[PDB]
Amino acid sequence: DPEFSWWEEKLTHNRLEVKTEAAAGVTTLAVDTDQAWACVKGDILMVESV
């Protein structure tokens, strides 16, 4: 055909940003829109540093 197409896919980290400050002892965190869908039960998340 005079018009042709292709598909590309990237592999990326599972990175979340906490919008609302949470103190120690809080079991619920607020993240950016639709970011929590990637995570499921059993994932291990760790706070990152500069």
Binding site: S5, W7, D34, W37, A38, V40
Partner: protein
């Protein structure tokens, strides 16, 4: 990202999913007892100069 845990026919890209097609044309023609060129088939032929 889809979390539903079940990929379905709806959970695909814009043109990732073509449907099914029958790759031919079904033709309709006039029907009758005589051939299509009825007058011609019941006719003689002779050359002209």
């Amino acid at each position: 990202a889809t979390i539903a845990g079940l990929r379905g026919t709806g959970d695909w890209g814009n043109q990732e999913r073509p449907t099914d097609f029958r790759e031919t044309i079904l033709w309709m023609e006039p029907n009758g007892q005589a051939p299509l060129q009825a007058l011609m088939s019941k006719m003689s032929s002779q050359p002209t100069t």
